[PDB]
Design an enzyme around this catalytic site. Structure first.
Site, mmCIF file in Angstrom:
data_model
loop_
_atom_site.group_PDB
_atom_site.id
_atom_site.type_symbol
_atom_site.label_atom_id
_atom_site.label_comp_id
_atom_site.label_asym_id
_atom_site.label_seq_id
_atom_site.Cartn_x
_atom_site.Cartn_y
_atom_site.Cartn_z
ATOM 1 N N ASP B 84 56.022 42.276 53.790
ATOM 2 C CA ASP B 84 55.280 43.188 54.635
ATOM 3 C C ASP B 84 54.518 42.275 55.581
ATOM 4 O O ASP B 84 53.886 42.727 56.532
ATOM 5 C CB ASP B 84 54.310 44.049 53.807
ATOM 6 C CG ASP B 84 53.675 43.291 52.644
ATOM 7 O OD1 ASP B 84 54.422 42.773 51.791
ATOM 8 O OD2 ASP B 84 52.429 43.232 52.567
ATOM 9 N N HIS B 147 47.881 37.072 43.635
ATOM 10 C CA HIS B 147 48.907 38.043 43.968
ATOM 11 C C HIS B 147 50.239 37.334 43.774
ATOM 12 O O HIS B 147 51.040 37.730 42.917
ATOM 13 C CB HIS B 147 48.776 38.555 45.397
ATOM 14 C CG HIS B 147 49.932 39.398 45.825
ATOM 15 N ND1 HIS B 147 50.637 40.186 44.942
ATOM 16 C CD2 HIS B 147 50.531 39.547 47.028
ATOM 17 C CE1 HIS B 147 51.628 40.779 45.585
ATOM 18 N NE2 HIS B 147 51.585 40.409 46.852
ATOM 19 N N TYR B 194 43.215 49.242 45.724
ATOM 20 C CA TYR B 194 44.038 48.071 46.002
ATOM 21 C C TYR B 194 43.904 47.061 44.862
ATOM 22 O O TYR B 194 44.896 46.674 44.234
ATOM 23 C CB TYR B 194 43.602 47.403 47.308
ATOM 24 C CG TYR B 194 44.566 46.337 47.780
ATOM 25 C CD1 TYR B 194 45.624 46.654 48.633
ATOM 26 C CD2 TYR B 194 44.450 45.019 47.337
ATOM 27 C CE1 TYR B 194 46.544 45.686 49.032
ATOM 28 C CE2 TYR B 194 45.364 44.043 47.727
ATOM 29 C CZ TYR B 194 46.408 44.384 48.574
ATOM 30 O OH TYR B 194 47.320 43.427 48.955
ATOM 31 N N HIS B 227 45.974 43.612 55.181
ATOM 32 C CA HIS B 227 46.129 45.065 55.131
ATOM 33 C C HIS B 227 44.793 45.760 55.309
ATOM 34 O O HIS B 227 43.814 45.394 54.671
ATOM 35 C CB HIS B 227 46.686 45.509 53.774
ATOM 36 C CG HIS B 227 48.071 45.029 53.480
ATOM 37 N ND1 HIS B 227 49.191 45.601 54.042
ATOM 38 C CD2 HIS B 227 48.519 44.057 52.651
ATOM 39 C CE1 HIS B 227 50.271 45.003 53.568
ATOM 40 N NE2 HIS B 227 49.890 44.062 52.722
HETATM 41 C C1 LIG Z 1 53.062 43.165 43.104
HETATM 42 C C2 LIG Z 1 54.295 42.278 42.945
HETATM 43 C C3 LIG Z 1 54.268 41.662 41.593
HETATM 44 C C4 LIG Z 1 55.327 40.764 41.174
HETATM 45 N N1 LIG Z 1 55.367 40.126 39.869
HETATM 46 C C5 LIG Z 1 56.362 39.305 39.528
HETATM 47 C C6 LIG Z 1 56.355 38.706 38.247
HETATM 48 O O1 LIG Z 1 55.523 38.825 37.323
HETATM 49 N N2 LIG Z 1 57.471 37.819 37.935
HETATM 50 C C7 LIG Z 1 58.581 37.532 38.907
HETATM 51 O O2 LIG Z 1 59.450 36.750 38.468
HETATM 52 N N3 LIG Z 1 58.521 38.144 40.126
HETATM 53 C C8 LIG Z 1 57.533 38.995 40.536
HETATM 54 N N4 LIG Z 1 57.562 39.581 41.818
HETATM 55 C C9 LIG Z 1 58.699 39.234 42.696
HETATM 56 C C10 LIG Z 1 59.882 40.198 42.641
HETATM 57 O O3 LIG Z 1 60.376 40.216 41.317
HETATM 58 C C11 LIG Z 1 60.921 39.693 43.604
HETATM 59 O O4 LIG Z 1 60.381 39.707 44.983
HETATM 60 C C12 LIG Z 1 62.219 40.505 43.745
HETATM 61 O O5 LIG Z 1 63.054 39.872 44.680
HETATM 62 C C13 LIG Z 1 61.991 41.973 44.208
HETATM 63 O O6 LIG Z 1 63.199 42.703 43.903
HETATM 64 P P1 LIG Z 1 63.531 43.906 44.856
HETATM 65 O O7 LIG Z 1 63.710 43.379 46.313
HETATM 66 O O8 LIG Z 1 64.857 44.468 44.278
HETATM 67 O O9 LIG Z 1 62.441 44.893 44.730
HETATM 68 C C14 LIG Z 1 56.482 40.449 42.131
HETATM 69 C C15 LIG Z 1 56.445 41.117 43.492
HETATM 70 C C16 LIG Z 1 55.416 41.982 43.882
HETATM 71 C C17 LIG Z 1 55.436 42.599 45.218
#
Ligand SMILES: Cc1cc2nc3c(=O)[nH]c(=O)nc-3n(C[C@H](O)[C@H](O)[C@H](O)COP(=O)(O)O)c2cc1C
Ligand SMILES: Cc1cc2nc3c(=O)[nH]c(=O)nc-3n(C[C@H](O)[C@H](O)[C@H](O)COP(=O)(O)O)c2cc1C
Ligand SMILES: [Zn+2]
Ligand SMILES: [Zn+2]
Ligand SMILES: [Zn+2]
EC number: 1.-.-.-
Lengths: 398, 398
Positions: B84, B147, B194, B227
């Site tokens: 984003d 984050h 948030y 944001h």
């Molecule tokens: C709020 C948020 C929390 C996340 N927590 C983790 C996490 O604990 N472990 C991890 O391996 N990836 C984490 N990610 C990364 C996603 O797993 C990764 O970007 C993935 O490519 C998203 O899959 P998608 O495009 O199918 O939604 C997180 C992403 C976001 C936005």
């Protein structure tokens, strides 16, 4: 208002719930409402099979008085207690105090726990028993766990009429009452949605009770469930469908439910489906956050493959995917093959959760560690997902 | 359209997303859309901090050409790569291929993974490191796991300006840009929604990072997150707020989330509520199937008690409750007490899943085997729940 006659003397006296959009709390979605069916048999001794959902007791009584001014009611059959069927139990007893209640044991105990303070004559019935009303009698058939423990059916041999309660019903609201007055295709789909969401885990118990009714050569000319349309024309059609769904041989179909935050998991989903379609297998693709869990389950009943996907958030699954998973664990899809997939950015965690849940649902994983991807799918990756779906297709073969 | 000057030479050049309703995919719900902020610093060497969600790249570029047409861009700072924010990376990189990218190590890796086919003159950055642009300069502060791993803040000492990206941001779309131009109450609630849904599991890293900035004695006159609104008139209040939420001392409040099919569980929810209110506790009641999990989670931030109830269907928990449970396990609520509860009709099973998940979320049960009822609550049953809410009330004391 107006009661409907199934045959001379036997009438439908339930109510139609047109505006209900959710049944069993927030569980079963009823896009087209539903109805609480109750059946009255007028003989030397008149009986009332099951009642109505409390909020509709008025319509019941009204339809009852529509058959005979002061309501007689010598017997009160209770195949089920649930609530959508026994809620008017009190209202009815006060209406006809001396009415005699015929039911299974667990039904009686349940009836005593959900109401109490209500005095009434009873007589625990068992599979095979039989009470007469004069020209017509009503033998019974215990139907344990065919939805609930207190469950049972009511058979009026004299007319080859079967009153199975919840079983063989569908959640549909219509001013029409019989299957020959509804679209054959659409009514059966609803029947499938009901089975998929309610009777799926009791499939084996179903094949059993089914064969049983067959061994005894019970002439079933018409089936009147407690929800939806009364099967009068072709009752063998749902008997056979139930038979088929219960066995669960399936079709060369594959359901892919999933969700994603940034599309990586979605791509993996297309790749799996592309390969699956190539294996000459049909596919239903559901993005969970915009699909009816209830409709997704209905689709699975027929499919021989189930693939669930999700990226990982805080080392866990994407909440939106949780409901589908736990609902599958409890429904226990008879004989199914599946896979889990998804992306992650560093540690991951969704894949384990998914596979444990899937295994708990008794879904034979076609490839234990499923196709996981970091950040974005790569060509080699998508190709892997492709052949993987290609692989599943080949197993579901047909 | 137009860019907004935070101060001479520094402009807001992001985009407002009015129609978005679900951020992070189906995860976080934005009842009021959001914005993807991006800032441009015009010095002897102009720099760009972050970009924008791909679908709004035209807006970004459009706004840049409005400060200086032939787009300069000596430095391009990637505080975070999420999407984003970095979605318009390739677009901005094509606009200015000669751009010097400033980022963390993990950022670089992610960037090379999410894009490749895109080379750029970079230079990994670390806490303290500093780049000069002329009159003004920009120092960076690594913010690992605040984050995301690649996260970090950009600080412009000459103006006491802080560009933390996601931290201190709120998902809300307004035509106005600064906090002094928004309802203090409404904006701070969003700020909380948030934090509660995204930063909750990193509370400890939050206080530490906050303290670290306190030691370094950084002069923060304004905070412009990625944001939402820009804390220009009072950055103190949001910093105090984050510090507070991070600690997790909480409030003598309790959140009860649940759902049922026939009310028994609802009644228990009520009983517990009464006992809690009696104990002088504020209570928030949420029937999950009709509430926003994100709004519910927001409420838990302040709460010192979390109670989750549910009947038992097919020996499992009611699917509607799954989400909250799994979102909590991942979110890891700090310093919370809780209790599971619900009804069953014969076997039970949702209580184990509830206490299982609840514990996994690091929630201290006030009574391992929680209140449970069979069919319908009895007088003592409710009285018991009352006493239990009364007990939790006592412990959350305050
Ligand atoms: C709020 C948020 C929390 C996340 N927590 C983790 C996490 O604990 N472990 C991890 O391996 N990836 C984490 N990610 C990364 C996603 O797993 C990764 O970007 C993935 O490519 C998203 O899959 P998608 O495009 O199918 O939604 C997180 C992403 C976001 C936005
Ligand atoms: C589709 C359906 C499935 C059920 N499955 C179970 C079960 O596996 N085990 C059990 O002990 N009770 C089961 N029940 C009974 C409920 O747990 C019980 O009726 C309870 O009183 C309902 O709680 P509520 O009034 O809070 O909705 C089931 C009920 C329905 C309608
Ligand atoms: Zn009606
Ligand atoms: Zn414009
Ligand atoms: Zn009260």
């Amino acid at each position: 208002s107006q009661p409907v006659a199934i045959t001379d003397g036997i009438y439908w006296v339930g109510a139609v719930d047109w505006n209900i959009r959710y049944f069993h709390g927030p569980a079963f979605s009823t896009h087209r409402g539903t109805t609480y069916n109750a059946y009255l048999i007028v003989d030397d001794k008149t009986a009332l099979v099951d009642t109505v959902y409390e909020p509709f007791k008025e319509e019941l009584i009204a339809k009852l008085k529509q058959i005979k001014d002061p309501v007689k009611l010598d017997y009160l059959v209770v195949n089920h207690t649930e609530s959508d069927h026994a809620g008017a139990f009190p209202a009815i007893m006060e209406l006809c105090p001396d009415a005699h209640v015929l039911c299974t044991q667990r039904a009686f105990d349940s009836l005593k726990a959900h109401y109490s303070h209500i005095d009434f004559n009873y007589t625990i019935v068992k599979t095979g028993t039989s009470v007469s009303l004069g020209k017509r009698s009503l033998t019974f058939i215990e139907a344990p766990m065919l939805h609930w423990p207190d469950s049972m059916f009511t058979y009026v041999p004299e007319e080859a009429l079967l009153l199975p309660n919840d079983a063989f019903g569908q959640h549909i609201a219509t001013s029409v009452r019989f299957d020959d007055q509804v679209d054959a295709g659409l009514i059966m789909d609803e029947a499938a949605k009901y089975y998929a969401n309610i009777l799926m885990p009791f499939s084996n118990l179903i094949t059993k009770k089914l064969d049983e009714i067959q061994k005894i050569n019970l002439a079933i000319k018409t089936i009147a469930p407690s929800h939806g349309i009364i099967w009068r024309k072709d009752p063998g059609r749902i008997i056979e469908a139930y038979a088929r769904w219960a066995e669960g041989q399936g079709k060369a179909k594959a359901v892919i439910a999933y969700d994603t935050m940034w599309l990586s998991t979605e791509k993996m989903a297309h790749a799996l489906m592309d390969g699956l379609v190539a294996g000459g297998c049909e596919v239903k693709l559901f993005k969970l956050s915009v699909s009816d869990r209830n409709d997704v389950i209905k689709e699975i009943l027929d499919a021989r493959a189930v693939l669930v996907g999700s990226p990982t958030i805080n080392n866990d699954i994407l909440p939106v995917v949780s409901p589908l998973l736990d609902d599958l664990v409890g429904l226990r899809p008879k004989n199914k093959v599946g896979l889990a997939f998804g992306a992650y950015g560093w540690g991951g965690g969704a894949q384990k959760i998914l596979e444990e849940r899937l295994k708990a649902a008794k879904i034979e994983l076609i490839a234990e560690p499923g196709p996981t991807v970091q950040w974005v799918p790569r060509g080699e990756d998508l190709q892997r997902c492709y052949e993987l779906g290609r692989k599943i297709a080949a197993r579901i073969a047909d």
